[PDB]
């Protein structure tokens, strides 16, 4: 996240970090005790059996007793299209169930087909790049964004920070977009570099996949 602020510790208990060594590469959202939702492109050319799913984290550079670490057992994809970047969503089944507590909780999803119009105020968040100065963030960042149609496709939810250069960046993919307390987006792609000040950020529209998610989840 570029131009955002540190989140209050454990303010978003559904926030997940996907790691390869002990290196964060994508975010995710806890949707059930044993399932996380992320962007398909995050797991496309990665060694899935090597991915660690980190729950209850705040500061990645610190030892945090609040953490819960899981492995990936199965992957559920919908119609991921890497050329067009459509259906950039994946469900990952954990090798166990999280211990729900103050620091780890399940996110609330929107109803199927609910669409956001121009002007809805939402919060983006992630541990991605801070700009081109600053690599990945250590502490979770959050950012107020506005939904915009316009320089956006009907197949995405796009956002823009008006009047300043701010936005999601590499490493933010898979992280939630929260609007009116529900998960409405999954960070998918940028255009013109991160925080162009032109080109809205693009998210996978979770409302369009609710029926599918449920079918797997419950």
């Amino acid at each position: 996240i570029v131009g955002g602020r540190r989140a209050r510790p454990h303010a978003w208990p559904f926030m997940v970090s996907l790691q390869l060594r002990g290196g964060h590469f994508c975010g995710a959202t806890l949707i059930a005790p044993n399932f996380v939702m992320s962007a398909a492109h995050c797991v496309a050319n990665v060694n899935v059996r090597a991915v660690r799913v980190v729950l209850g984290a705040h500061n990645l550079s610190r030892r945090e007793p609040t953490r819960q670490v899981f492995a990936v057992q199965r992957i559920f994809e919908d119609g991921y299209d890497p050329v067009n970047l459509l259906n950039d969503i994946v469900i990952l089944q954990l090798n166990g169930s999280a211990t729900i507590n103050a620091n780890v909780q399940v996110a609330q999803l929107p109803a199927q087909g609910r669409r956001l119009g121009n002007g809805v105020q939402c919060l983006a968040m992630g541990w991605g790049l801070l700009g081109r100065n600053r690599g990945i963030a250590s502490v979770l960042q959050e950012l107020n964004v506005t939904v915009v149609t316009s320089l956006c496709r009907r197949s995405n939810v796009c956002t823009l920070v008006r009047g300043r250069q701010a936005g999601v960046c590499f490493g933010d993919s898979g992280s939630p977009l929260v609007c009116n307390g529900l998960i409405h987006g999954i960070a998918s792609f940028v255009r013109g570099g991160c925080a162009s000040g032109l080109y809205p950020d693009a998210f996978a529209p979770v409302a369009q996949f609710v029926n599918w998610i449920d079918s797997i989840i419950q």
Binding site: A39, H41, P82, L85, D88, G128, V168, C169, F170, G171, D172, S173, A187, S188, F189, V190, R191, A202
Partner: peptide, 4 residues
């Protein structure tokens, strides 16, 4: 577009 660059996937993030």
């Amino acid at each position: 577009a660059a996937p993030a």
